[PDB]
């Protein structure tokens, strides 16, 4: 009679309840039901797959879920027809698969309904138009999470032996960890260049105070290397004339950033509330299934018309006409952003303080990125004194337009060309050149992005793997690679070079995609992986005399 409709959590189920009527009987599954557990019989048994037997697998129920797949299968049959409400990356693709497959029944029973969020509309949407279960996407998911059963279970074997009990590879993790290890050994061998820098205070005819750096000496780039040097240049431009050569006045504006995607809201997250990549993704996990955001997994800065006209709505009304673009902005599946505007972080049921914070962030990034530019009113004066050349920059707020959704927050004074200016004091100071920046869970996540190698459903996963599994850290918010990330980084790109390669590793990902679009196929995907792989893992296993793995 009625329909039965799937979701992966209790939480995702409540929401979705209150959108659906009493056609409808909504049920969890209460997580993923079924999953994976020259050959070698026991390795094909641990890991559920046989590459040698055309990546025939043998997936198993979850343990506990057997009684779970008794209560749908019973449910299965009072209804007409089965909706799979699963998240709608190629991960709840594979999720509904696995549901449709235990469940069994004739195909033609089943829908799999997609949505960024769970709100009335949304959900009427889904719903109304209900799609079939794409096998690209299942394929696609499956491809990826058979060549990371691979990698882990085949060459953690030989990093016991060559070098440690316990050790795990990871696919993509690896290539992770290689990022860290190259920046520590970056900073290890870095020897820092001294220079300094002359700044000079200076008086306007008005007797306004003027601060200055030294910008050029005998018109080519100024850098004392040394105390003699920057001497030398003091003892002159002790000596000499100040006098505004050219006042450079331009009007400049800020723009709003583009709404969230999972990258850019890891970074902004750690950064502007010290929150970690982790709890950042189990939050917004919580706010989109409470039904408070759109689908925290998207690489889509995407807006709907008609989240961009609610947003424009609220700008005019709550901030006003001169804070609202004459036309919506567009930045370019949907960003992470509010599913009601009108909804404030205060108002969060369910919540807990950071969750709200996290909400509140997404919710100002949503409104400024609709908002108009800053405008400010910029000033460059360029001096010059004797042999020197020297400048200030300034700017004076004109319109806050964006900030205005931000919390609460140099002015030169004003001078004329040709104007002499006075000199009060010479400040020389001494400097050193630094080494490149360590990572930052946020740098770490954007160069992850940057490079091509991590994806929404990743991410975080990528991150958080290779810390527990003692191959970096992180200590004052910045990131160490360990020793044993050292050792085993070499051990890895000498013997698998293709596997740590950075291009290649894109690539993959992108591989991945093409299966997702039906642009190739999984097995023989998996099939150039596996020979690229083994070639790679016959050559590793042999004596270091013969090229394979140095142990210790």
């Known amino acids: 009679g009625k329909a039965l409709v799937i979701v992966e959590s209790p939480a995702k189920a409540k929401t979705i309840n209150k959108y659906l009527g009493s056609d409808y009987v909504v049920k969890s599954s209460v997580g993923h039901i079924r999953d994976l557990p020259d050959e070698r019989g026991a390795l094909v048994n641990r890991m559920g797959v046989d590459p040698w037997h055309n990546w025939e697998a043998h997936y198993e129920v979850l343990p506990g879920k057997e009684k779970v797949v008794s209560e749908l299968k019973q449910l299965a049959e009072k209804a007409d027809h089965i909706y799979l409400a699963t998240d709608l990356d190629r991960e709840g693709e594979a999720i509904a698969w696995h549901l449709r497959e235990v469940i069994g029944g004739d195909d033609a029973r089943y829908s799999r309904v997609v949505f960024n969020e769970i709100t009335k509309n949304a959900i009427r949407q889904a719903f109304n138009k209900p799609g079939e279960l794409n096998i690209d996407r299942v394929n696609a998911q499956q491809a990826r999470r058979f060549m990371d059963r691979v990698v882990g279970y085949m060459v953690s074997p030989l990093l016991w032996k060559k070098i440690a009990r316990g050790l795990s590879a990871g696919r993509v993790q690896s290539v992770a960890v290689r990022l860290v290890v190259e920046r520590e050994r970056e900073i290890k061998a870095f020897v820092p260049e001294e220079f300094w820098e002359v700044d000079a205070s200076t008086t306007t005819p008005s007797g306004e105070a003027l601060a200055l750096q030294v910008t050029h000496q005998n018109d080519k780039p100024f850098r004392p290397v040394n105390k003699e040097q920057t001497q030398a240049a003091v003892s002159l431009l002790e000596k000499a004339r100040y006098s505004v050569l050219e006042r450079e006045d331009k009007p400049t504006t800020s723009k709003p950033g583009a709404p969230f995607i999972t990258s850019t809201l890891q970074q902004a997250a750690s950064t502007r509330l010290g929150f970690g990549v982790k709890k950042t993704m189990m939050m917004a996990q919580r706010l989109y299934e409470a039904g408070y955001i759109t689908y925290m997994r998207t690489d889509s800065t995407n807006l709907?018309?008609?989240?961009?006209?609610?947003?424009?709505?609220?700008?005019?009304?709550?901030?006003?006409?001169?804070?609202?673009?004459?036309?919506?902005?567009?930045?370019?599946?949907?960003?992470?952003?509010?599913?009601?505007?009108?909804?404030?972080?205060?108002?969060?049921?369910?919540?807990?303080?950071?969750?709200?914070?996290?909400?509140?962030?997404?919710?100002?990034?949503?409104?400024?990125?609709?908002?108009?530019?800053?405008?400010?009113?910029?000033?460059?004066?360029?001096?010059?004194?004797?042999?020197?050349?020297?400048?200030?920059?300034?700017?004076?707020?004109?319109?806050?337009?964006?900030?205005?959704?931000?919390?609460?927050?140099?002015?030169?004074?004003?001078?004329?060309?040709?104007?002499?200016?006075?000199?009060?004091?010479?400040?020389?100071?001494?400097?050193?050149?630094?080494?490149?920046?360590?990572?930052?869970?946020?740098?770490?996540?954007?160069?992850?992005?940057?490079?091509?190698?991590?994806?929404?459903?990743?991410?975080?996963?990528?991150?958080?793997?290779?810390?527990?599994?003692?191959?970096?850290?992180?200590?004052?918010?910045?990131?160490?690679?360990?020793?044993?990330?050292?050792?085993?980084?070499?051990?890895?790109?000498?013997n698998f070079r293709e596997l740590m390669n950075y291009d290649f590793t894109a690539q993959m990902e992108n591989s991945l995609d093409q299966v997702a679009n039906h642009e190739a196929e999984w097995k023989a995907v998996l099939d150039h992986f596996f020979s690229d792989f083994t070639q790679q893992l016959d050559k590793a296993e042999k004596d270091p005399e013969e090229g394979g793995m140095r142990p210790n």
């Open 304 to 494: 709907s018309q008609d989240a961009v006209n609610m947003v424009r709505g609220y700008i005019s009304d709550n901030f006003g006409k001169k804070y609202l673009p004459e036309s919506p902005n567009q930045y370019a599946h949907e960003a992470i952003r509010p599913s009601d505007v009108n909804v404030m972080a205060e108002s969060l049921k369910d919540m807990e303080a950071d969750a709200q914070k996290l909400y509140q962030l997404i919710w100002r990034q949503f409104v400024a990125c609709q908002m108009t530019p800053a405008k400010y009113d910029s000033t460059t004066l360029t001096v010059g004194a004797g042999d020197f050349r020297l400048k200030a920059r300034g700017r004076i707020l004109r319109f806050d337009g964006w900030t205005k959704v931000m919390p609460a927050l140099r002015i030169l004074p004003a001078v004329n060309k040709g104007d002499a200016l006075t000199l009060v004091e010479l400040t020389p100071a001494q400097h050193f050149t630094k080494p490149p920046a360590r990572f930052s869970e946020a740098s770490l996540v954007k160069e992850l992005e940057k490079r091509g190698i991590g994806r929404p459903s990743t991410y975080a996963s990528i991150i958080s793997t290779i810390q527990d599994r003692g191959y970096v850290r992180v200590e004052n918010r910045r990131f160490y690679a360990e020793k044993m990330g050292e050792i085993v980084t070499d051990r890895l790109e000498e």
